[PDB]
Every structure is written in C-alpha cells, then in structure tokens.
Scaffold this motif. Structure first.
Motif, PDB file in Angstrom:
ATOM      1  N   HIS A  82     -50.313 -14.012  -9.855  1.00  0.00           N
ATOM      2  CA  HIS A  82     -49.038 -14.725  -9.749  1.00  0.00           C
ATOM      3  C   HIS A  82     -47.973 -14.265 -10.769  1.00  0.00           C
ATOM      4  N   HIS A  84     -44.157 -15.611 -12.935  1.00  0.00           N
ATOM      5  CA  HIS A  84     -43.768 -16.767 -13.729  1.00  0.00           C
ATOM      6  C   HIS A  84     -42.296 -17.100 -13.536  1.00  0.00           C
ATOM      7  N   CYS A  89     -43.799 -17.163 -20.653  1.00  0.00           N
ATOM      8  CA  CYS A  89     -45.081 -17.830 -20.440  1.00  0.00           C
ATOM      9  C   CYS A  89     -46.077 -17.424 -21.523  1.00  0.00           C
ATOM     10  N   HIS A 136     -50.284 -11.488 -13.397  1.00  0.00           N
ATOM     11  CA  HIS A 136     -51.629 -11.505 -13.949  1.00  0.00           C
ATOM     12  C   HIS A 136     -52.515 -12.460 -13.171  1.00  0.00           C
ATOM     13  N   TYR A 153     -44.312 -22.685 -20.967  1.00  0.00           N
ATOM     14  CA  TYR A 153     -43.394 -21.935 -20.131  1.00  0.00           C
ATOM     15  C   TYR A 153     -41.976 -22.387 -20.388  1.00  0.00           C
TER      16      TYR A 153
END
Ligand SMILES: [Fe+2]
Length: 186
Positions: A82, A84, A89, A136, A153
């Motif tokens: 995915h 961010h 993050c 990642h 985040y």
C-alpha cells in the motif's frame, strides 16, 4: 529542543509541539519516536488484537495535523502492499518484529510488482516511509510472537491504495479503527 520522551504521554506532548507548525521535520520526528523506549504498560490499553487480522487502534488525533495509532499483528498477520496518500508515515516497533517489504510504484502496465528491498524491523526501531520512497508491505512472520507497532501519519488519511502484487492494480481502501482511545469501535 528535542528531549527524550520518558513515556508515551511525553512522546505525545513532544509530537504536538513538533507539529505545531505546518511543515514537519521528518528526522526530528523519527528521532523522538526512536528515543521512546517501549513500555508495554504505557500502551497496553491500545494493544487490542484480533485473531484473524491486524487491528488499527487510534491513540491520538493530534490537533488535526497527524494520527498516532497502534497496530497489533498476530502471528502471521500482514498488510497488503500500500501507499500513504501523499502523507508522511512513521512506524515504531513497540513489541516483536515486523518484516517490511518495499515495492516500487508499478508502471502503468500489469506485471508483478517487484520488491525493491526487504528488512526486519526490531523492537523500538522506527522506520519512515512516504510515497516518493515507495510502497511497502508489513508482516509479522513470527510463528510465536505477536508484534505491536506505533504509527504516526501526517497529515492524517482515511484511505490508501492497496496493490495486487501480481498485476500491480490498486484499490482504494478505507482504513478502519478497531479501537479509538482505548475504546473498541466496531
Ligand atoms: Fe504502511
């Protein structure tokens, strides 16, 4: 002036100061996360596990500049690949070990995403990712030890994209909190 956080609370106070402005200093944030020594008593309350998948537990909403949440990974639990959502993050291990696999952004074609890099994140280790770096996948590959992590985040984001390792196609997923401030939220 960056001080060592004694406690999660302290940590969170320092984070509020670092994020008082509107442009963050990633290094400084990573350094205070790294400097906090994981103390399970201090976060036990947020470490709610599920038998089937990892859980996101909101710790602090950060006066709107950042989310701080704890994730709990049972044995063999993992995320998908995915991004961010154009946000910063940070990720600190509070307990256990996570294996992080970084992928490059897929090209527009449908081919198996190929792993840039791989690494094990150990307790108290703090890792940083953002979309320019890559995508990642984080997993607990341990067969005996659950893992728990601290995630910051900024800015906060509701949704992200998940990638099919095979074709590299992506879906918007809307991340859901298992709990919020210690309270279970179905
Ligand atoms: Fe992530």
């Amino acid at each position: 002036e960056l001080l060592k956080p004694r406690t999660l609370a302290d940590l969170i106070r320092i984070l509020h100061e670092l994020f008082a402005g509107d442009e963050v200093n990633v290094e400084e944030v990573q350094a205070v996360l790294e400097a906090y020594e994981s103390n399970p008593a201090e976060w036990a309350l947020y470490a709610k596990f599920d038998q089937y998948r990892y859980t996101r537990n909101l710790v602090d909403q950060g006066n709107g500049k950042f989310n701080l949440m704890i994730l709990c990974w049972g044995e063999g639990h993992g995320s998908s690949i995915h991004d961010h959502t154009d946000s910063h993050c940070f990720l600190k291990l509070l307990q256990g070990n996570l294996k992080e696999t970084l992928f490059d952004w897929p090209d527009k074609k449908s081919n198996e995403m190929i792993k840039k890099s791989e690494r094990t994140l150990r307790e108290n280790q703090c890792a940083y990712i953002n979309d320019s770096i890559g995508l990642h996948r984080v997993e607990n590959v341990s067969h005996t030890e659950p893992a728990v992590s601290l995630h910051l985040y900024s800015p906060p984001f509701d949704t992200c994209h998940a990638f099919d390792q095979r074709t590299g196609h992506k879906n918007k997923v809307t991340m859901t909190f298992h709990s919020k401030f210690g309270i279970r939220t179905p």
